[PDB]
Design a protein around this ligand. Structure first.
Ligand code: DCP
Ligand code: MG
Ligand code: MG
Length: 515
DNA sequence: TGGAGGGGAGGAC
DNA sequence: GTCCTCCCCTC
């Protein structure tokens, strides 16, 4: 019915449910990504400004580039020498490090491979990286996001998704202060829908009324992706998204004012579109993708099917083959080749996998789950694939890793020396989590993984005992030593020392709430 | 890249 | 039944 909204009361009311808000076509999701994160952390640690060309350095690689340094053409994974050729006033700052034989990490400022003095070197032979300064700042940001929003998923060290559903719903229905103009409040613009909601006489399966003309005065905060110049507010999804953009800006300002960090943000009805949108414009920007602009955005030429989370590896490449996708404009191709429903694509997939020709042992497509795959591709190609936000435990796993150069791990005694660093590092991380979150954090399972001189991988995992935080490092080392000596035996008569990599990972934890 | 963190399949136990 | 090994996803 073109006399009514495309959306129902059900879809609007479900914004107030944390468990179901994501499946609403009115969903309002934000993806927020810290700009040049490790470089910003170092900038703030060193009392530097947004104009200083900082780069964060790990061994000889630039692993984060401030926006000031980007103006010189410096890119992530430039070598430090390459970057110095591009910018005479560069401020390279090495990550913090642990020294082999010590049990604490620190910064050695003024030191690195670009320093002439051999007294101010940070040797790859005798140190390991600590990412803990970045992890600490990430946890501080997470606390601010969770204070502002009831459903936050940490997606990586510098990324979160927010479900703004409750905030948007509540603003839409109950906010009596928000002004659209000097003469018009949100409460008056929305008098019809609020009357209906408070009156309580709607049927959940009925469509909403067409939006009132007065709500078209509501503004989006940020950059609205709109190359075709479409009308900004035409249905209730736009209203919710505009309100969400106002809230998101306030949250991002809290991050900036409290921690000092600039962010980019993407706002849309789905996690996958939000993630693309947050990367569209940087630094310090919010890109908003309206439902009516989804195809304009997805087809702008920046993106392919492999741009979507889960599709950037081997499965994505198999799909390119299986679906005969072109090398460019694959998203539009999927949309137009199976234009009506996902059943069209499922039929195509079922035929491909039913062939005796198809190798189930090497494929990453589950032949029993082609309905799910077809729906996922069908909806992703339209910007309408809604995934829930998880919200994670305090920790799930914890790894300490050292890739080894030359003969720096040439025997079991060297292995154990590095394991001692790993155990000190992990125990310190666990202790910090226990204090910060008021928990008991108990490692249950440990995995040792290593690579030989010939790059062959050897792994072993198993249980670790628990005796309290004061014995944690010892308990971890006990298992580490057992596993490295077990693997040494397994490597007998084979190419082994010197190792090229050794790592320890606590792969399973128990977490106990206190208070 | 190195140095992370997430997640799951399936045979071993 | 759960555990261990190996593999695939991402920043
Ligand atoms: N392969 C990678 C990718 C990233 N990082 C680190 C350094 C980054 O600062 C941080 C977050 O990654 P992003 O991809 O968000 O990159 P930045 O925040 O540095 O830059 P942008 O402003 O483009 O987000 O993780 C890393 O160590 N190894
Ligand atoms: Mg970032
Ligand atoms: Mg990122």
């Amino acid at each position: 019915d073109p006399h009514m909204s495309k959306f129902t009361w059900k879809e609007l009311i479900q914004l107030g449910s944390p468990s179901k808000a994501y499946e609403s076509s009115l969903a309002c999701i934000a993806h927020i990504d810290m700009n040049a994160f490790f470089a910003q952390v170092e900038q703030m640690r060193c009392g530097l400004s947004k104009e200083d060309p900082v780069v964060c350095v790990q061994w000889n690689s630039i692993i984060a580039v401030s926006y000031a340094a980007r103006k010189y053409g410096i890119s992530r994974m430039d070598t430090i020498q390459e970057a110095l050729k591009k910018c005479s006033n560069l401020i390279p700052i090495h990550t913090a490090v642990f020294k082999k034989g010590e049990d604490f990490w620190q910064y050695h400022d003024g030191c690195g491979s670009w320093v002439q003095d051999p007294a101010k070197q940070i040797s790859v032979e005798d140190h390991k990286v600590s990412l803990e300064p970045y992890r600490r700042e990430s946890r501080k940001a997470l606390a601010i996001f969770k204070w502002a929003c009831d459903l936050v998923e940490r997606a990586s060290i510098d990324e979160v998704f927010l479900d703004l559903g409750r905030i948007c719903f509540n603003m839409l229905m109950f906010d009596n202060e928000y002004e659209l103009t000097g003469d018009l409040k949100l409460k008056d613009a929305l008098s019809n829908i609020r009357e209906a909601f408070i009156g309580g006489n709607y049927d959940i399966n009925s469509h909403l009324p067409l939006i009132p003309e007065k709500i078209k005065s509501l503004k989006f905060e940020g950059d609205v992706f709109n190359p075709e110049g479409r009308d900004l507010i035409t249905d209730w999804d736009d209203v919710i998204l505009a309100l969400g953009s106002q809230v998101c800006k306030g949250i991002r300002d809290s991050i900036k004012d409290i921690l000092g960090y600039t962010t980019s943000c993407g706002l849309s009805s789905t996690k996958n579109v939000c993630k693309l949108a947050s990367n569209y414009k940087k630094p310090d920007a919010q890109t908003i993708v309206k439902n009516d602009c989804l195809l304009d955005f997805l087809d702008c030429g920046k993106f392919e099917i492999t741009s979507f989370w889960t599709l950037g590896g081997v499965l994505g490449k198999e799909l390119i083959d299986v679906l005969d996708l072109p090398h460019e404009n694959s998203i539009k191709h999927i949309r137009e080749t199976w234009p009506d429903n996902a059943g069209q694509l499922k039929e195509f997939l079922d035929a491909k996998v039913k062939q005796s020709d198809y190798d189930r042992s090497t494929s990453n497509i589950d032949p029993l789950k082609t309905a799910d795959l077809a729906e996922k591709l069908f909806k992703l190609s339209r910007g309408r694939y809604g995934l829930p936000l998880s919200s994670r435990p305090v920790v799930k796993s914890m790894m300490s890793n050292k890739n080894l150069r030359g003969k720096s791990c040439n025997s079991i005694v060297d292995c154990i020396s590095w394991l001692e660093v790993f155990c000190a590092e992990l125990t310190s991380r666990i202790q910090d989590l226990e204090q910060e979150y008021n928990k008991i954090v108990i490692p249950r399972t440990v995995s040792i993984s290593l690579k030989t001189k010939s790059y062959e991988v050897y792994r072993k995992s198993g249980p670790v005992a628990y005796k309290g935080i004061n014995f944690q490092s010892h308990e971890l080392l006990k298992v580490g030593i057992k596993f490295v000596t077990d693997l040494d035996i397994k490597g007998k008569n084979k190419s082994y020392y010197p190792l090229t990599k050794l790592s320890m990972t606590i792969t399973n934890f128990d977490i106990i709430d206190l208070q």
